[PDB]
Amino acid sequence: MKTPLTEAVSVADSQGRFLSSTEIQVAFGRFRQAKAGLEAAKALTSKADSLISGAAQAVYNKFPYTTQMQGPNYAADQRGKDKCARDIGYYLRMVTYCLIAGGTGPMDEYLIAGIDEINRTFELSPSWYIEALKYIKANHGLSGDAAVEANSYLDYAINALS
């Protein structure tokens, strides 16, 4: 799982070496940053319900046919709308995990790997989700390093979908 601490150990283990000042520096970096990352996860978690509803609304506004077209892959009914808000909540939950771990590992593990096959099979459009992520980026209201790290994980997901 891609994170400063596990990768430092992983690399060293692969080389059969004890940890050295190099890995120790990797940890200093993770701990200097964890102060901002844990504060961001706290905040995002507080604004979760609003960020999810606002994000889903922004998607429908940009792609109105999604709320109209008949089909299990759309949100014309309550079932589809619930699936959609659920998916967006997943993305947001994954982002807070990344801030807590200090790396993309959690998202890579639980969400990015296999996403292409899913979107193709169930005919879901990457563009819809990209819109949702752009919305959360412009509305989380984080500041300083907290905002910078948070935005890095949202853009990461966006890059994975495009």
Partner 1 sequence: MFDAFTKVVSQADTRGEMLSTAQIDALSQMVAESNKRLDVVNRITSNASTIVSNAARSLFAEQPQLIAPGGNAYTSRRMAACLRDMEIILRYVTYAVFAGDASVLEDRCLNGLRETYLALGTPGSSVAVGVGKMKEAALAIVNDPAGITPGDCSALASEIAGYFDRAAAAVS
Ligand X SMILES: *[C@@H](C)[C@H]1/C(=C/c2[nH]c(/C=C3N=C(/C=C4\NC(=O)C(CC)=C4C)C(C)=C\3CCC(=O)O)c(CCC(=O)O)c2C)NC(=O)[C@@H]1C
Size of the site for ligand X (CB under 6 A): 8
Contacting range for ligand X; rule: CB under 6 A; set: 62-70, 73-81, 131-139, 148-156: 148-156
Instruction: Check residue 4 for interaction with a copy of itself (CB under 8 A).
Output: yes
Indicate the residue type of 3.
T
Instruction: Check residue 70 for interaction with a copy of itself (CB under 8 A).
Output: no
Residues 27-44: b if buried by 16+ CB within 10 A, e if exposed: eeebeebeebbebbbebb
Residue placing its CB nearer to partner 1 in the complex, 64 or 120: 120
98 is in an annotated binding site: no
- Among partner 1, a copy of itself, ligand X, none, the one that 36 touches (CB under a kind-dependent 5 to 8 A) is ligand X
Tell the smallest beta-carbon distance from residue 111 to a copy of itself (Å): 15
Tell the smallest beta-carbon distance from residue 148 to partner 1 (Å): 7
CB pairs under 8 A, 24+ apart, for 95-98? Answer: 95/44, 95/136, 95/150, 95/153, 95/154, 95/157, 96/40, 96/41, 96/44, 96/45, 97/41, 98/153
Angle between helices 78-101 and 144-160 (to 10 degrees): 130
Contacting range for a copy of itself; rule: CB under 8 A; set: 41-49, 51-59, 99-107, 132-140: 99-107
Consecutive H or E run containing 104: none
Tell the smallest beta-carbon distance from residue 22 to a copy of itself (Å): 4
What's the CA gap between 108 and 161, in Å, rounded? Answer: 12
Annotated binding residues for (2R,3E)-phycocyanobilin, written as ranges, equal 84
